[PDB]
């Protein structure tokens, strides 16, 4: 019922849904398991425009059936004609992923790895997020880096980084290493404050040494924009904004 055409990255295939009029489909061939799956089941019947489809599991180890969308936010960007993106058109789809990611924390679900390469982009212009529920650190959020927590913030912190790379197409943190990362970053917020610095981590706060204009690295960044970077881009978990608060602020 499926033939795979071409290899992707488990590891996604590119097949042909032969019951289904030989449309294109993404074949992922990979007890928490079967949970996980009994989720993303779950997740599919609200079946949410932002988020890809999920057309069948089969069984026989476990594969996987996504509708296909023939590119992702990394292609979108290498193609888009210079000056870039339009502002309104960053608006919208970072409008249409955070309409997505407070799907998933509604239901408690962390994508934990958001990034470009996951995050697809339909014939229509429509964002879906892709490869959850089952390296670059360019977007991993600060208390992941450290080893500390791993809630739902952790995704905000990847929005404020994709966020920005619409603007400057390019990556805004990027790292070599955990530790890389971590200075990298910092260098642009500053450091946190010993009040907001985990109490549990092995890297020291003192293990780095200001702030710094954020429109310097996102060039044509509105105020309402930067104001909802920097609420993304927050250091503290805690006190970084969520999804769904960031669908009503200002900027939208
Ligand atoms: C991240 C990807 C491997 C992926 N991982 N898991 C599911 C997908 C998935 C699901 C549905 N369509 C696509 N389309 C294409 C989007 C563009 N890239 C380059 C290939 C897959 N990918």
Not at 49 to 61: A, E, G
Not at 135 to 152: F, G, K
Not at 201 to 222: N, Y
Request: net charge neutral.
């Amino acid at each position: 019922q499926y033939e795979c055409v071409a290899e992707i990255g488990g590891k996604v295939f590119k097949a042909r849904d032969l019951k289904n009029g030989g449309r294109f489909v993404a074949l992922k061939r990979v007890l928490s398991t079967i949970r996980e799956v009994a989720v993303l089941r779950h997740l599919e019947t609200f079946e949410h425009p932002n988020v890809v489809r999920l057309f069948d599991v089969c069984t026989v180890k476990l594969t996987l059936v996504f509708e296909h969308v023939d590119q992702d936010l990394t292609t979108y960007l290498d193609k888009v004609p210079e000056p870039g993106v339009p502002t309104e058109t960053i608006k919208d789809m970072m409008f249409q992923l955070l309409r997505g990611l407070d799907f998933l924390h509604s239901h408690r679900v962390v994508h934990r790895d958001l990034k470009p390469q996951n995050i697809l982009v339909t014939s229509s212009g429509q964002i879906k997020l892709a490869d959850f529920g089952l390296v670059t650190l360019w977007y991993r959020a600060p208390e992941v880096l450290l080893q500390s927590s791993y809630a739902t913030p952790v995704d905000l912190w990847s929005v404020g980084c994709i966020f920005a790379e619409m603007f400057r197409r390019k990556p805004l943190f990027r790292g070599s290493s955990d530790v890389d990362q971590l200075g990298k970053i910092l260098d642009v917020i500053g450091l946190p404050g010993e009040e907001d610095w985990p109490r549990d981590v092995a890297l020291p706060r003192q293990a780095f040494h200001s702030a710094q204009p954020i429109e310097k690295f996102v060039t044509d960044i509105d105020e309402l924009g930067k104001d909802l970077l920097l609420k993304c881009l927050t250091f503290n978990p805690a006190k970084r904004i969520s999804a769904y608060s960031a669908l009503s602020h200002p900027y939208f």
